[PDB]
């Protein structure tokens, strides 16, 4: 009941940066899992479980988008303790985040940026359909079964529920966050979610992000450094709009023609994973 006493802690899985997520084991099952634990003192957003209980915003947005779509990583449990909370979050397994994968094999070939990019937008999609903004899309906050070959979404910390109205406050990566966000401090959810659904794809497909300072994200040029499609670059430039009402809706971006004929993740994983190369 206490905690110790169900998982079996093992080693620490962050490496690099803050944070404190170790890999933990579920004792009666042996089922893999990731225990996260947050400080009390480090939590600017709380909210209500459905049953009133003053709670980490993080721990609302994941049981609202916990359920059945693996879309994200689901929040097995959660604890309590006198300056923190302890999160329970399944863990796949052999996994690797998107950054280690793009560091490692550098730009993704379009084919396998089709599958990974179609993937996160089926999860953010589903953030949304819970009524879930995560706000902190990035290759870092995205994990990838390689047995399947399905990404998982992660680390809703900065998330926030989804409301129509404008936002004023953000605290996720700022070379992710849009030129509104930049110039005004203020954006809307939906249309800032795709600004940074531009820079992740372009990050695939180049191998790194397109903007590096406040000046080039208001200027909202890109330059390609590698050879991409003319179909996915103009994906990238269209959700990279300066004003935000150009930018495409999520089914434009999956209407797109660039985006036709996605590969099913155990194909992509057979194709591009499976195999040692
Ligand atoms: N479910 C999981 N399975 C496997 N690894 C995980 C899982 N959740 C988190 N991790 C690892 O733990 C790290 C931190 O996760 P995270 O959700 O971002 O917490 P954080 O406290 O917000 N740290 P950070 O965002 O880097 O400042 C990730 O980069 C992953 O390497
Ligand atoms: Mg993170
Ligand atoms: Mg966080």
Redesign the pocket.
């Known amino acids: 009941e206490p905690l110790e006493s169900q998982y079996q802690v093992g080693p620490l899985?962050?490496?690099?940066?803050?944070?404190s997520?170790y890999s933990g084991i579920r004792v009666s099952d042996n089922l893999p899992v990731?225990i996260?634990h947050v400080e009390k003192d480090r939590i600017s957003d709380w909210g209500e479980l459905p049953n009133g209980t003053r709670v980490p915003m993080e721990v609302v947005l994941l049981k609202k988008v916990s359920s059945g779509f693996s879309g994200v990583?689901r929040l097995l449990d959660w604890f309590e303790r006198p300056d923190s909370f302890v999160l329970i979050?399944?863990?796949?397994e052999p996994?690797q985040?998107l950054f280690d994968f793009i560091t490692e094999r550098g730009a993704l070939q379009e084919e396998l940026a089709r599958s990974f990019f179609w993937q996160v937008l089926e999860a953010v999609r589903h953030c949304h359909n819970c009524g879930v903004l995560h706000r902190d899309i990035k290759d870092?906050?995205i994990?990838i079964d390689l047995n399947r070959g399905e990404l998982k979404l992660?680390?809703f910390?900065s998330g926030a529920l989804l409301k129509d109205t404008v936002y004023t406050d953000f605290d996720g990566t700022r070379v992710y966050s849009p030129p509104e966000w930049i110039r005004y401090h203020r954006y809307h959810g939906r249309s800032a979610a795709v600004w940074s659904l531009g820079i992740l794809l372009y990050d695939m497909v180049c191998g790194d992000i397109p903007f590096e300072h406040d000046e080039e994200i208001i200027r909202g040029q890109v330059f390609f450094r590698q050879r991409v499609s003319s179909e996915c670059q103009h994906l990238i430039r269209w959700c990279l709009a300066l004003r935000p009402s150009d930018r495409p809706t999520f089914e434009e971006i999956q209407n797109h023609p660039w985006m036709q004929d996605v590969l099913l993740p155990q194909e992509t994983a057979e194709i591009h994973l499976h195999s040692l190369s």
């Open positions: 899985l962050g490496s690099g940066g803050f944070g997520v990731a996260k990583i979050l399944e863990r796949p996994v985040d870092e906050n994990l992660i680390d910390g």
